[PDB]
Design a protein around this motif. Structure first.
Motif, PDB file in Angstrom:
ATOM      1  N   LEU A   1       8.947  -6.404  -0.955  1.00  0.00           N
ATOM      2  CA  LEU A   1       7.614  -6.542  -0.247  1.00  0.00           C
ATOM      3  C   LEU A   1       6.714  -7.618  -0.887  1.00  0.00           C
ATOM      4  O   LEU A   1       6.100  -8.399  -0.158  1.00  0.00           O
ATOM      5  CB  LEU A   1       6.890  -5.190  -0.154  1.00  0.00           C
ATOM      6  CG  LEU A   1       5.620  -5.217   0.717  1.00  0.00           C
ATOM      7  CD1 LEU A   1       5.917  -5.751   2.132  1.00  0.00           C
ATOM      8  CD2 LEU A   1       5.019  -3.821   0.842  1.00  0.00           C
ATOM      9  N   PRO A   2       6.560  -7.643  -2.217  1.00  0.00           N
ATOM     10  CA  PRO A   2       5.671  -8.663  -2.743  1.00  0.00           C
ATOM     11  C   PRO A   2       6.024 -10.100  -2.313  1.00  0.00           C
ATOM     12  O   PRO A   2       5.149 -10.904  -1.984  1.00  0.00           O
ATOM     13  CB  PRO A   2       5.831  -8.543  -4.266  1.00  0.00           C
ATOM     14  CG  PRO A   2       6.081  -7.050  -4.444  1.00  0.00           C
ATOM     15  CD  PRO A   2       7.056  -6.781  -3.313  1.00  0.00           C
TER      16      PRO A   2
ATOM     17  N   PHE B   1      -2.585  -4.551   0.134  1.00  0.00           N
ATOM     18  CA  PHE B   1      -2.925  -4.846  -1.258  1.00  0.00           C
ATOM     19  C   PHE B   1      -2.206  -6.150  -1.710  1.00  0.00           C
ATOM     20  O   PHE B   1      -2.816  -6.999  -2.385  1.00  0.00           O
ATOM     21  CB  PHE B   1      -2.565  -3.637  -2.129  1.00  0.00           C
ATOM     22  CG  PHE B   1      -2.371  -3.940  -3.597  1.00  0.00           C
ATOM     23  CD1 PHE B   1      -3.465  -4.056  -4.448  1.00  0.00           C
ATOM     24  CD2 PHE B   1      -1.095  -4.124  -4.113  1.00  0.00           C
ATOM     25  CE1 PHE B   1      -3.305  -4.312  -5.808  1.00  0.00           C
ATOM     26  CE2 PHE B   1      -0.935  -4.425  -5.468  1.00  0.00           C
ATOM     27  CZ  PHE B   1      -2.028  -4.526  -6.307  1.00  0.00           C
ATOM     28  N   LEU B   2      -0.915  -6.283  -1.405  1.00  0.00           N
ATOM     29  CA  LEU B   2      -0.140  -7.471  -1.887  1.00  0.00           C
ATOM     30  C   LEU B   2      -0.618  -8.717  -1.149  1.00  0.00           C
ATOM     31  O   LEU B   2      -0.737  -9.794  -1.754  1.00  0.00           O
ATOM     32  CB  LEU B   2       1.359  -7.212  -1.636  1.00  0.00           C
ATOM     33  CG  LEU B   2       1.966  -6.074  -2.487  1.00  0.00           C
ATOM     34  CD1 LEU B   2       3.348  -5.668  -1.933  1.00  0.00           C
ATOM     35  CD2 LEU B   2       2.078  -6.533  -3.943  1.00  0.00           C
TER      36      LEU B   2
ATOM     37  N   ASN C   1       7.263  -0.780   2.191  1.00  0.00           N
ATOM     38  CA  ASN C   1       7.288  -1.036   0.723  1.00  0.00           C
ATOM     39  C   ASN C   1       8.763  -1.118   0.245  1.00  0.00           C
ATOM     40  O   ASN C   1       9.618  -0.353   0.680  1.00  0.00           O
ATOM     41  CB  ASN C   1       6.553   0.027  -0.089  1.00  0.00           C
ATOM     42  CG  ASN C   1       6.226  -0.481  -1.474  1.00  0.00           C
ATOM     43  OD1 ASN C   1       6.012  -1.674  -1.648  1.00  0.00           O
ATOM     44  ND2 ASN C   1       6.329   0.363  -2.476  1.00  0.00           N
ATOM     45  N   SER C   2       9.072  -2.062  -0.629  1.00  0.00           N
ATOM     46  CA  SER C   2      10.390  -2.149  -1.238  1.00  0.00           C
ATOM     47  C   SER C   2      10.254  -3.119  -2.402  1.00  0.00           C
ATOM     48  O   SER C   2       9.188  -3.675  -2.605  1.00  0.00           O
ATOM     49  CB  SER C   2      11.428  -2.662  -0.258  1.00  0.00           C
ATOM     50  OG  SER C   2      11.274  -4.084  -0.029  1.00  0.00           O
TER      51      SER C   2
ATOM     52  N   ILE D   1      -0.007  -0.607   0.856  1.00  0.00           N
ATOM     53  CA  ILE D   1       0.567  -1.512  -0.184  1.00  0.00           C
ATOM     54  C   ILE D   1       0.674  -2.950   0.338  1.00  0.00           C
ATOM     55  O   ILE D   1       0.333  -3.871  -0.378  1.00  0.00           O
ATOM     56  CB  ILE D   1       1.942  -1.015  -0.710  1.00  0.00           C
ATOM     57  CG1 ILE D   1       1.892   0.458  -1.124  1.00  0.00           C
ATOM     58  CG2 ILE D   1       2.397  -1.919  -1.874  1.00  0.00           C
ATOM     59  CD1 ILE D   1       0.774   0.817  -2.077  1.00  0.00           C
TER      60      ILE D   1
END
Ligand SMILES: NC(=O)c1ccc[n+]([C@@H]2O[C@H](COP(=O)([O-])OP(=O)(O)OC[C@H]3O[C@@H](n4cnc5c(N)ncnc54)[C@H](OP(=O)(O)O)[C@@H]3O)[C@@H](O)[C@H]2O)c1
Ligand SMILES: NC(=O)c1ccc[n+]([C@@H]2O[C@H](COP(=O)([O-])OP(=O)(O)OC[C@H]3O[C@@H](n4cnc5c(N)ncnc54)[C@H](OP(=O)(O)O)[C@@H]3O)[C@@H](O)[C@H]2O)c1
Ligand SMILES: NC(=O)c1ccc[n+]([C@@H]2O[C@H](COP(=O)([O-])OP(=O)(O)OC[C@H]3O[C@@H](n4cnc5c(N)ncnc54)[C@H](OP(=O)(O)O)[C@@H]3O)[C@@H](O)[C@H]2O)c1
Ligand SMILES: NC(=O)c1ccc[n+]([C@@H]2O[C@H](COP(=O)([O-])OP(=O)(O)OC[C@H]3O[C@@H](n4cnc5c(N)ncnc54)[C@H](OP(=O)(O)O)[C@@H]3O)[C@@H](O)[C@H]2O)c1
Ligand SMILES: COC(=O)C1CCN(C(=O)c2ccc(CNC(=O)c3ccc4nc(N)sc4c3)cc2)CC1
Ligand SMILES: COC(=O)C1CCN(C(=O)c2ccc(CNC(=O)c3ccc4nc(N)sc4c3)cc2)CC1
Ligand SMILES: COC(=O)C1CCN(C(=O)c2ccc(CNC(=O)c3ccc4nc(N)sc4c3)cc2)CC1
Lengths: 250, 249, 254, 239
Positions: free
Chosen positions: D67-68, D122-123, D63-64, D119
């Motif tokens: 990430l998205p 999820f993205l 995650n950062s 995460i």
């Protein structure tokens, strides 16, 4: 006027501790028993010595049969005849022994005993309790290990799984009548006196919290919570009282 | 060389679709039935027309009684009598009707709902294992077992017991190489007695497509669980419910 | 000497009811808050007027960030600074709003708030609570406020739901790992309790009508009662359990 | 031909899943973080069987702030290469202990265990659905999620979060015709093997892959929100 409770299988061990704590809380109690008449009577005398006319005994076999519905109706009726009310039902009585799938009771007797005591009698008692009807509630003694079954205990495990379903089904169906229905799921509690200490210690060492089985009184404390005004919005819930045992992987 | 399967309650609806899909996969089938004699015989005729001597019927009442063990033993025996082996048991037969807690005798209701949904599967499992490649049992469970229908206590207790059996038998029979798994429909073929408006009420609740499962969609999961693609799966219950069990009140 | 508890998100609503009930039970309390400074101080004043020097406030953002560990450490430190001990932690603070998967805060801010408050801050507070401990009287426990509807999630609340599932995992993992230290870890899972203040009466009543037991939401005090049970000596053998307080809501089909 | 994205596809379970999808007729995006040589070796093997059916895509799934964008680019790589994206398999996973009672910082462990395990899925789920037939997502879950390994709190929280994503996404994307399901391996050393009911042995990666193939197939078209344990019975065994 004091409320009244029925506790099945109340002469010894966990059901005895439940009956004692309910009595200490102010309930009058029907002590149901099957074979242990001397112990049921000795408990009733102890409780009545504490407060006169607050305990009676009721004998019945809870094995499934043609007569079980009448037997369960009679247990509930005995509470109304003794005390004029029935506020709490605790379904504690239970048969427990292995029924291996692969190879002197016949298997249909084993079915009648293990499914009758653990599931059918609770259902018939629940029907009779509700039909006869404040803080009304039913507490079913479940099993925290119901989804990690002991090897060769299929009928026992099926009866306990059925009891989970009764606890949930009855909570939903009786909620409109103001009757709550919940469960208490021990992990390992009072072990057999005859079991060798070496075997008892194997079980005790599995429990994360304290490496020791639950006392009957610790199980009774969860029952007392569920029937209390501190649980008046709780229905359909099964509280494990297992010291973390069900969270331990193989 | 062809393996053989028992399917209970296989004359109509979901059990029929299971028997047909096992037969299409290469299995010889015992079509168990209780009352639906014409439908069972018709199905066995259709399957035998496709491959001769690959289907038999076997009549039994799976209500609990002191003779249910012998009936269950006889169902398994009929598979060995016809085909010389029994590789798969599908526990599909099921009684389903309401049993309100507040106002047939109640002990008959217990015998029918607990017998068909839980005791008969247990006795069939015992007989299957005792009478003994890729052996497995598939139990038809209920995806809604923890969100029960109002006034269906004894039915729900029987399906919860069947989860217990699936898990207990998976554990106990693993050393014999028998896998035990379940398929849990949500709403599939709706009861014949149901009115159209009520049918549509239930269809509208299903997230995936707003429709019930076909019997063939249920059968597909059974096929997977008995296949070599599921050889490391035991004790698992696959919901085939279009998301219904995930929808809140 | 009186035991002491930290309650997160304790200025209002359920967290306030839990702090009040622990206070009435004889605990000294740290009232943690983020934005509700006036409500927190007003509560601590009320409790201090009942018994002197038995409540303090502690401000902290529990959004995930590289300083969240220090913030969680400082919440626990505040209980020891005020009261000399810390017997109970109640992880109540929670962010709650939709994060639709198919189309204002950036998605990474939503992750930090929904997963930080509902799961990462409980994890770090649990670590700091256990580390700060390290015989005939001790009764240490953590209570996590979970969600009875965790397996029947609301449409478009993925990140909130992932956070509450993570909190079930923490509850069970921490119960297992901290049992050797005598710290019990349990959860209380409301269904519908105090409805969000934003909600109109019609929308509140739709939810009320779904509850089997009484067709009404739980009071804050009903939630707090289950917390009081789990921290009490009547729950001394209970760890890793999550008690639903939902009036049957989670049992109701679509 | 349909197209699939498999994360963490260079080795072990993710590799077996990519191989089996490819054998079933899918074109595949082989995602990797550090294993470029292994990812390209697999793409070379698949492309030798059928030309231009396998591409690789590098991304760190920690995650950062970025990430998205990384997850959006994984899904876009599928559309770039193949013109469509029918299947997402969220296989990549970080796994290590994070004791509650005492040299990555704890917030780095959060970013890796919660970011990769929950995460990123999820993205990736968001990007997969936004860019939209038999569409489905399969999440690699853990059969031991409710009997966790001692000192693995953050790992276990991530896998629990992944069960919630599986169920939330199944409900939210059902109207889009996207199914969302899970496969939960148990163990896929001899101490662990001996406790497994079925054969006292771990699952091959191919057995995990078989369950993924079932869930993306037309034989699972009514199945969403379901998590299939492939664990040899291990989760049913008491302590
Ligand atoms: N002990 C544990 O570790 C443990 C663990 C998990 C769950 N539980 C559950 O907790 C509850 C209490 O446990 P426990 O160990 O105290 O139980 P227990 O000693 O095995 O049995 C309780 C009583 O059940 C009654 N009972 C048995 N068969 C009966 C029948 N055919 N008809 C009528 N009554 C019958 C017996 O009464 P008489 O003596 O009068 O014949 C017996 O004293 C049970 O439901 C059990 O399944 C216990
Ligand atoms: N349909 C659904 O929506 C749905 C949903 C959840 C779960 N399920 C489960 O899926 C399975 C198949 O569902 P279904 O709708 O196809 O079932 P069904 O039509 O209700 O019943 C299946 C068959 O069970 C047999 N059966 C009933 N009582 C019996 C008895 N006393 N003895 C022997 N056999 C008896 C009947 O055979 P005869 O016709 O030969 O008498 C009947 O045709 C069941 O286990 C059911 O509980 C179905
Ligand atoms: N209400 C219900 O029906 C219901 C249902 C299911 C579960 N629950 C659970 O029960 C617990 C209590 O519910 P509730 O309705 O009383 O909660 P709430 O009012 O939604 O929130 C409680 C407190 O959380 C704090 N909070 C929010 N974001 C924060 C952040 N980034 N940093 C630090 N604190 C933050 C706020 O403190 P400040 O006001 O100081 O900013 C807020 O007052 C929650 O965990 C909730 O998930 C509630
Ligand atoms: N093996 C088992 O027994 C078992 C048991 C239960 C569940 N599972 C689950 O099944 C799935 C696959 O298991 P496995 O043993 O094959 O997994 P694994 O070898 O532990 O890891 C899979 C791949 O995940 C990638 N990964 C790790 N951290 C990453 C990061 N920060 N960014 C991007 N990619 C990262 C790595 O790819 P690169 O090598 O390209 O860096 C790695 O090769 C996982 O979800 C796992 O949790 C496995
Ligand atoms: N005999 C055994 O194999 C055995 C199996 C499990 C245990 C641990 N479980 C319990 O002791 C237990 C579990 C459930 C139970 N229900 C009753 N009515 S008594 C009872 C005891 C102990 C011995
Ligand atoms: N009668 C009803 O009220 C009712 C209850 C539930 C449903 C939805 N469930 C099913 O249709 C269903 C559910 C289980 C089931 N088991 C069988 N043997 S047939 C069967 C049908 C439909 C009508
Ligand atoms: C203007 O309307 C609102 O208040 C918004 C927030 C709530 N909302 C909902 O859709 C919604 C979903 C579930 C419910 C029932 N659940 C709860 O009220 C609930 C559930 C969990 C929870 N966690 C918190 N920290 S507060 C909280 C409240 C109520 C409203 C969207 C619109």
């Amino acid at each position: 006027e004091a409320p009244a409770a029925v506790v099945t299988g109340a002469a010894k061990r966990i059901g005895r501790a439940i009956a004692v704590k309910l009595h200490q809380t102010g309930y009058r109690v029907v002590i149901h028993y099957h074979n242990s008449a001397e112990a049921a009577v000795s408990l009733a005398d102890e409780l009545n010595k504490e407060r006169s006319n607050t305990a009676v005994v009721c004998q019945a076999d809870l094995t499934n049969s043609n007569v079980l519905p009448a037997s369960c109706e009679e247990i509930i009726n005995s509470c109304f005849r003794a005390f004029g009310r029935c506020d709490v039902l605790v379904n504690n009585a239970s048969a427990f022994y292995p029924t291996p799938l692969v190879q002197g009771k016949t298997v249909e007797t084993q079915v009648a005993e293990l499914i009758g005591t653990n599931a059918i009698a609770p259902f018939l008692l629940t029907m009779s309790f509700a039909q006869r009807q404040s803080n009304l509630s039913i507490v079913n003694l479940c099993d925290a290990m119901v989804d990690q079954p002991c090897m060769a205990f299929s009928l026992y495990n099926m009866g306990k799984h059925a009891l989970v379903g009764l606890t949930q089904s009855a909570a939903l169906e009786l909620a409109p009548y103001g009757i709550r229905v919940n469960g208490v799921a021990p992990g390992v509690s009072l072990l057999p006196v005859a079991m060798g200490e070496e075997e008892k210690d194997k079980w005790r060492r599995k429990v994360p919290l304290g490496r020791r089985e639950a006392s009957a009184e610790q199980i009774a404390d969860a029952v007392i919570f569920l029937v209390s005004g501190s649980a008046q919005y709780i229905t359909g819930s099964i509280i494990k009282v297992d010291g973390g045992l069900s969270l331990v992987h193989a």
